[PDB]
Design a protein around this ligand. Structure first.
Ligand code: NI
Length: 341
Protein backbone atom coordinates (compact mmCIF):
# COMPACT_ATOMS: atom_id res chain seq x y z
CA UNK A 1 0.00 0.00 0.00
CA UNK A 2 1.07 3.71 -0.34
CA UNK A 3 3.67 4.46 2.30
CA UNK A 4 3.07 7.37 4.67
CA UNK A 5 6.20 9.23 3.51
CA UNK A 6 4.51 9.71 0.05
CA UNK A 7 1.41 11.46 1.54
CA UNK A 8 1.12 15.24 2.36
CA UNK A 9 -1.00 15.66 5.57
CA UNK A 10 -3.91 18.08 5.42
CA UNK A 11 -4.23 17.71 1.73
CA UNK A 12 -5.52 15.34 -0.82
CA UNK A 13 -1.95 15.15 -2.25
CA UNK A 14 0.63 12.47 -3.00
CA UNK A 15 4.24 12.75 -4.26
CA UNK A 16 5.87 10.14 -6.59
CA UNK A 17 3.02 7.66 -5.86
CA UNK A 18 1.94 6.18 -9.25
CA UNK A 19 2.37 2.43 -8.64
CA UNK A 20 -0.32 1.79 -5.96
CA UNK A 21 -3.42 2.10 -8.15
CA UNK A 22 -6.01 4.63 -7.04
CA UNK A 23 -4.83 6.06 -3.77
CA UNK A 24 -7.94 6.56 -1.69
CA UNK A 25 -8.61 10.23 -1.16
CA UNK A 26 -5.96 11.56 -3.59
CA UNK A 27 -7.09 14.57 -5.64
CA UNK A 28 -3.72 15.60 -7.19
CA UNK A 29 -0.64 13.39 -7.93
CA UNK A 30 2.69 15.32 -7.99
CA UNK A 31 5.77 13.97 -9.85
CA UNK A 32 9.15 15.46 -8.78
CA UNK A 33 11.21 14.18 -11.81
CA UNK A 34 11.33 11.71 -14.66
CA UNK A 35 13.20 8.77 -13.12
CA UNK A 36 11.54 5.31 -13.30
CA UNK A 37 11.42 4.51 -9.54
CA UNK A 38 9.37 7.71 -9.20
CA UNK A 39 7.06 7.63 -12.31
CA UNK A 40 6.51 3.84 -12.10
CA UNK A 41 2.90 3.32 -12.99
CA UNK A 42 2.15 6.20 -15.35
CA UNK A 43 0.99 5.59 -18.96
CA UNK A 44 -1.60 6.82 -21.60
CA UNK A 45 -4.39 5.25 -19.44
CA UNK A 46 -3.82 7.51 -16.41
CA UNK A 47 -6.86 9.85 -15.86
CA UNK A 48 -5.99 11.86 -12.70
CA UNK A 49 -4.34 15.32 -12.63
CA UNK A 50 -0.46 15.19 -12.66
CA UNK A 51 1.39 18.26 -11.43
CA UNK A 52 5.05 18.68 -12.45
CA UNK A 53 7.59 20.91 -14.17
CA UNK A 54 7.40 21.85 -17.87
CA UNK A 55 10.30 19.51 -18.72
CA UNK A 56 8.82 16.57 -16.84
CA UNK A 57 5.50 17.28 -18.65
CA UNK A 58 7.33 17.13 -22.10
CA UNK A 59 8.69 13.66 -21.18
CA UNK A 60 5.24 12.42 -19.89
CA UNK A 61 3.58 13.46 -23.24
CA UNK A 62 6.40 12.23 -25.59
CA UNK A 63 7.88 9.16 -23.86
CA UNK A 64 4.98 7.76 -21.85
CA UNK A 65 2.08 9.15 -24.03
CA UNK A 66 0.19 10.57 -21.10
CA UNK A 67 -2.72 12.64 -22.51
CA UNK A 68 -2.27 16.37 -22.48
CA UNK A 69 -5.54 17.09 -20.64
CA UNK A 70 -4.10 15.38 -17.45
CA UNK A 71 -0.65 17.11 -17.53
CA UNK A 72 -0.49 20.24 -15.45
CA UNK A 73 2.95 21.89 -15.81
CA UNK A 74 3.84 24.68 -13.36
CA UNK A 75 6.47 27.40 -13.72
CA UNK A 76 9.30 27.43 -11.22
CA UNK A 77 9.76 29.98 -8.42
CA UNK A 78 6.07 31.08 -8.72
CA UNK A 79 3.22 30.91 -6.12
CA UNK A 80 0.51 28.69 -7.66
CA UNK A 81 -2.86 27.42 -6.24
CA UNK A 82 -3.67 23.68 -6.66
CA UNK A 83 -7.04 22.42 -5.33
CA UNK A 84 -7.12 25.33 -2.96
CA UNK A 85 -3.58 25.02 -1.55
CA UNK A 86 -0.61 27.38 -2.31
CA UNK A 87 2.46 25.49 -3.72
CA UNK A 88 5.85 26.51 -5.21
CA UNK A 89 8.22 24.38 -7.37
CA UNK A 90 11.97 24.93 -6.80
CA UNK A 91 15.01 23.68 -8.75
CA UNK A 92 16.29 20.52 -7.08
CA UNK A 93 19.83 20.42 -8.74
CA UNK A 94 19.18 16.74 -9.69
CA UNK A 95 18.42 15.83 -13.37
CA UNK A 96 16.68 18.04 -15.95
CA UNK A 97 13.18 19.07 -14.89
CA UNK A 98 13.65 17.90 -11.25
CA UNK A 99 11.94 19.91 -8.56
CA UNK A 100 11.44 20.31 -4.82
CA UNK A 101 7.82 21.21 -3.71
CA UNK A 102 6.83 23.73 -0.99
CA UNK A 103 3.26 23.25 0.37
CA UNK A 104 1.55 25.99 2.45
CA UNK A 105 -1.16 24.17 4.42
CA UNK A 106 -4.41 25.95 5.26
CA UNK A 107 -3.60 25.57 8.98
CA UNK A 108 -0.25 27.52 8.65
CA UNK A 109 2.13 24.52 8.47
CA UNK A 110 4.79 24.77 5.76
CA UNK A 111 6.15 21.45 4.25
CA UNK A 112 9.18 21.07 1.89
CA UNK A 113 9.48 17.80 -0.14
CA UNK A 114 12.94 17.70 -1.68
CA UNK A 115 12.18 14.94 -4.18
CA UNK A 116 15.68 13.74 -5.25
CA UNK A 117 18.18 16.73 -4.82
CA UNK A 118 21.86 17.69 -4.61
CA UNK A 119 21.89 20.32 -1.87
CA UNK A 120 23.68 23.50 -2.74
CA UNK A 121 24.27 26.90 -0.90
CA UNK A 122 22.41 28.60 -3.78
CA UNK A 123 19.23 27.15 -2.34
CA UNK A 124 19.70 29.35 0.79
CA UNK A 125 18.75 32.32 -1.53
CA UNK A 126 15.62 30.97 -3.14
CA UNK A 127 12.03 31.49 -1.91
CA UNK A 128 13.02 29.14 0.92
CA UNK A 129 14.75 31.97 2.76
CA UNK A 130 11.39 33.88 3.11
CA UNK A 131 9.56 31.74 5.72
CA UNK A 132 9.93 28.94 8.23
CA UNK A 133 9.56 25.24 7.16
CA UNK A 134 8.08 22.98 9.76
CA UNK A 135 8.39 19.51 8.15
CA UNK A 136 11.06 18.31 5.62
CA UNK A 137 10.57 15.18 3.40
CA UNK A 138 14.29 14.54 2.73
CA UNK A 139 16.32 12.69 0.02
CA UNK A 140 18.59 10.72 2.36
CA UNK A 141 20.32 8.61 -0.41
CA UNK A 142 23.85 9.31 0.94
CA UNK A 143 23.08 10.05 4.60
CA UNK A 144 26.31 8.63 6.17
CA UNK A 145 29.72 10.34 6.63
CA UNK A 146 31.58 7.88 4.36
CA UNK A 147 29.90 9.50 1.37
CA UNK A 148 32.21 12.28 0.13
CA UNK A 149 32.53 13.25 -3.44
CA UNK A 150 34.07 16.02 -5.48
CA UNK A 151 32.22 18.91 -7.02
CA UNK A 152 30.56 18.31 -10.39
CA UNK A 153 32.95 21.00 -11.80
CA UNK A 154 36.09 19.07 -10.69
CA UNK A 155 34.78 15.85 -12.17
CA UNK A 156 33.97 17.51 -15.55
CA UNK A 157 37.46 19.12 -15.58
CA UNK A 158 39.01 15.63 -15.16
CA UNK A 159 36.83 14.11 -17.92
CA UNK A 160 37.52 16.94 -20.46
CA UNK A 161 41.35 16.89 -19.80
CA UNK A 162 41.45 13.01 -20.07
CA UNK A 163 39.45 12.89 -23.28
CA UNK A 164 41.27 15.80 -25.03
CA UNK A 165 44.72 14.28 -24.21
CA UNK A 166 43.72 10.78 -25.44
CA UNK A 167 42.22 11.86 -28.76
CA UNK A 168 45.10 14.37 -29.46
CA UNK A 169 47.65 11.58 -28.88
CA UNK A 170 45.53 9.18 -31.03
CA UNK A 171 43.09 10.77 -33.53
CA UNK A 172 41.73 7.30 -34.26
CA UNK A 173 40.42 6.80 -30.66
CA UNK A 174 36.60 6.70 -30.04
CA UNK A 175 35.09 8.14 -26.81
CA UNK A 176 32.05 6.24 -25.38
CA UNK A 177 29.83 7.38 -22.47
CA UNK A 178 27.19 5.23 -20.66
CA UNK A 179 23.63 6.28 -19.70
CA UNK A 180 20.41 4.60 -18.45
CA UNK A 181 18.24 7.60 -17.62
CA UNK A 182 18.11 11.38 -17.91
CA UNK A 183 20.70 13.21 -15.85
CA UNK A 184 24.48 13.71 -16.10
CA UNK A 185 24.23 15.25 -19.61
CA UNK A 186 27.17 17.60 -18.78
CA UNK A 187 29.57 14.54 -18.90
CA UNK A 188 29.02 13.69 -22.62
CA UNK A 189 28.26 17.27 -23.74
CA UNK A 190 31.43 18.76 -22.21
CA UNK A 191 33.64 16.06 -23.71
CA UNK A 192 32.01 16.48 -27.22
CA UNK A 193 32.49 20.30 -26.94
CA UNK A 194 36.30 20.02 -26.30
CA UNK A 195 36.68 17.55 -29.22
CA UNK A 196 34.61 19.55 -31.81
CA UNK A 197 32.14 16.64 -32.33
CA UNK A 198 28.39 16.09 -31.80
CA UNK A 199 27.35 13.28 -29.56
CA UNK A 200 25.93 10.32 -31.45
CA UNK A 201 23.14 8.20 -30.01
CA UNK A 202 20.09 6.08 -30.71
CA UNK A 203 16.82 7.53 -31.99
CA UNK A 204 15.14 6.70 -28.56
CA UNK A 205 17.80 8.66 -26.58
CA UNK A 206 17.86 11.56 -29.06
CA UNK A 207 14.04 11.89 -28.65
CA UNK A 208 14.46 11.95 -24.84
CA UNK A 209 17.11 14.71 -25.01
CA UNK A 210 14.98 16.80 -27.37
CA UNK A 211 12.37 17.10 -24.48
CA UNK A 212 14.82 18.86 -22.06
CA UNK A 213 14.89 22.58 -23.13
CA UNK A 214 18.69 22.52 -23.28
CA UNK A 215 19.86 25.66 -25.28
CA UNK A 216 21.42 25.07 -28.72
CA UNK A 217 20.80 21.28 -28.39
CA UNK A 218 20.40 20.85 -32.19
CA UNK A 219 24.08 21.96 -32.43
CA UNK A 220 25.33 19.31 -29.85
CA UNK A 221 23.64 16.00 -30.58
CA UNK A 222 22.91 13.71 -33.54
CA UNK A 223 21.60 10.31 -34.63
CA UNK A 224 24.37 9.99 -37.29
CA UNK A 225 26.92 7.78 -35.55
CA UNK A 226 29.34 7.94 -38.51
CA UNK A 227 29.88 11.72 -38.19
CA UNK A 228 30.44 11.54 -34.41
CA UNK A 229 33.46 10.52 -32.30
CA UNK A 230 31.62 10.68 -28.90
CA UNK A 231 29.05 7.82 -28.76
CA UNK A 232 26.37 7.22 -26.07
CA UNK A 233 25.41 3.68 -25.22
CA UNK A 234 23.32 1.97 -22.59
CA UNK A 235 25.21 1.70 -19.29
CA UNK A 236 24.87 -2.14 -19.62
CA UNK A 237 27.10 -2.14 -22.73
CA UNK A 238 30.02 -0.33 -20.83
CA UNK A 239 32.20 -3.39 -20.24
CA UNK A 240 35.00 -5.03 -22.28
CA UNK A 241 32.71 -7.46 -24.19
CA UNK A 242 30.12 -4.79 -25.00
CA UNK A 243 32.81 -2.32 -26.06
CA UNK A 244 34.82 -4.80 -28.25
CA UNK A 245 31.51 -5.54 -29.99
CA UNK A 246 30.75 -1.84 -30.55
CA UNK A 247 34.23 -1.25 -32.00
CA UNK A 248 33.65 -4.03 -34.60
CA UNK A 249 30.48 -2.10 -35.66
CA UNK A 250 32.47 1.05 -36.52
CA UNK A 251 34.16 -0.64 -39.52
CA UNK A 252 37.86 0.12 -38.86
CA UNK A 253 37.26 3.87 -38.40
CA UNK A 254 38.72 3.53 -34.88
CA UNK A 255 41.44 1.44 -33.17
CA UNK A 256 41.02 2.43 -29.48
CA UNK A 257 38.09 3.12 -27.03
CA UNK A 258 38.20 5.42 -24.05
CA UNK A 259 34.86 4.86 -22.09
CA UNK A 260 33.27 6.76 -19.11
CA UNK A 261 30.87 5.25 -16.49
CA UNK A 262 29.43 8.15 -14.39
CA UNK A 263 28.57 6.14 -11.28
CA UNK A 264 27.11 7.55 -8.05
CA UNK A 265 29.49 6.71 -5.18
CA UNK A 266 32.12 3.96 -5.22
CA UNK A 267 34.43 3.05 -2.16
CA UNK A 268 37.55 4.22 -4.09
CA UNK A 269 36.19 7.71 -2.77
CA UNK A 270 37.23 7.01 0.87
CA UNK A 271 40.90 6.81 -0.20
CA UNK A 272 41.37 8.23 -3.69
CA UNK A 273 41.30 11.92 -4.86
CA UNK A 274 39.95 12.79 -8.40
CA UNK A 275 43.49 13.63 -9.59
CA UNK A 276 44.52 10.01 -8.81
CA UNK A 277 41.67 8.05 -10.66
CA UNK A 278 42.85 5.30 -13.05
CA UNK A 279 41.08 3.18 -15.62
CA UNK A 280 40.49 -0.57 -16.01
CA UNK A 281 42.29 -1.54 -19.25
CA UNK A 282 42.13 -4.62 -21.54
CA UNK A 283 44.02 -4.31 -24.76
CA UNK A 284 42.99 -1.17 -26.68
CA UNK A 285 39.94 -0.50 -24.35
CA UNK A 286 40.08 1.64 -21.19
CA UNK A 287 37.07 2.24 -18.80
CA UNK A 288 36.98 5.15 -16.30
CA UNK A 289 34.42 5.13 -13.38
CA UNK A 290 33.95 8.81 -12.47
CA UNK A 291 32.05 9.95 -9.27
CA UNK A 292 29.60 12.37 -10.91
CA UNK A 293 26.72 12.61 -8.37
CA UNK A 294 23.29 14.20 -8.70
CA UNK A 295 22.55 13.58 -5.01
CA UNK A 296 23.79 15.43 -1.85
CA UNK A 297 27.03 14.31 -0.23
CA UNK A 298 26.70 13.79 3.57
CA UNK A 299 28.29 17.22 4.25
CA UNK A 300 26.07 19.02 1.65
CA UNK A 301 22.92 17.41 3.16
CA UNK A 302 24.01 18.33 6.72
CA UNK A 303 24.68 22.00 5.80
CA UNK A 304 21.23 22.36 4.13
CA UNK A 305 19.35 20.88 7.02
CA UNK A 306 21.33 22.85 9.70
CA UNK A 307 20.48 26.07 7.64
CA UNK A 308 16.83 25.19 7.24
CA UNK A 309 16.22 24.10 10.89
CA UNK A 310 13.11 22.01 10.33
CA UNK A 311 10.95 20.87 13.32
CA UNK A 312 10.47 17.30 11.95
CA UNK A 313 12.43 15.25 9.23
CA UNK A 314 10.80 12.42 7.27
CA UNK A 315 13.35 10.40 5.24
CA UNK A 316 12.30 9.20 1.77
CA UNK A 317 15.34 6.95 0.94
CA UNK A 318 16.88 3.94 2.76
CA UNK A 319 13.67 3.58 4.85
CA UNK A 320 13.37 -0.20 4.34
CA UNK A 321 15.60 -1.46 7.20
CA UNK A 322 15.51 -0.73 10.90
CA UNK A 323 19.31 -0.30 11.10
CA UNK A 324 19.17 2.33 8.33
CA UNK A 325 16.26 4.19 9.89
CA UNK A 326 17.95 4.20 13.34
CA UNK A 327 21.28 5.40 11.93
CA UNK A 328 19.64 8.31 10.04
CA UNK A 329 17.66 9.40 13.14
CA UNK A 330 20.93 9.49 15.13
CA UNK A 331 22.53 11.83 12.56
CA UNK A 332 19.43 14.08 12.57
CA UNK A 333 19.71 14.45 16.39
CA UNK A 334 23.45 15.18 16.17
CA UNK A 335 22.82 17.96 13.64
CA UNK A 336 20.10 19.52 15.76
CA UNK A 337 22.22 19.50 18.98
CA UNK A 338 25.29 20.90 17.21
CA UNK A 339 23.25 23.75 15.61
CA UNK A 340 20.90 24.51 18.51
CA UNK A 341 17.44 24.23 17.00
NI1 NI B 1 16.29 10.43 -9.21
Amino acid sequence: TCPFYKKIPGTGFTVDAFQYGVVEGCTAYFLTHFHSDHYAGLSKHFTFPVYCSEITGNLLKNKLHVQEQYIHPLPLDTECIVNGVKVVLLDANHCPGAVMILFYLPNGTVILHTGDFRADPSMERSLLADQKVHMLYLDTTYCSPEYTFPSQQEVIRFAINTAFEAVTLNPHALVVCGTYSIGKEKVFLAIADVLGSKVGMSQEKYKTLQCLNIPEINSLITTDMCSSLVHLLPMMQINFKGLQSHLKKCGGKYNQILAFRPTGWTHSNKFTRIADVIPQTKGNISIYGIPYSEHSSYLEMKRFVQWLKPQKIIPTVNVGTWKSRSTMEKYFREWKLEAGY
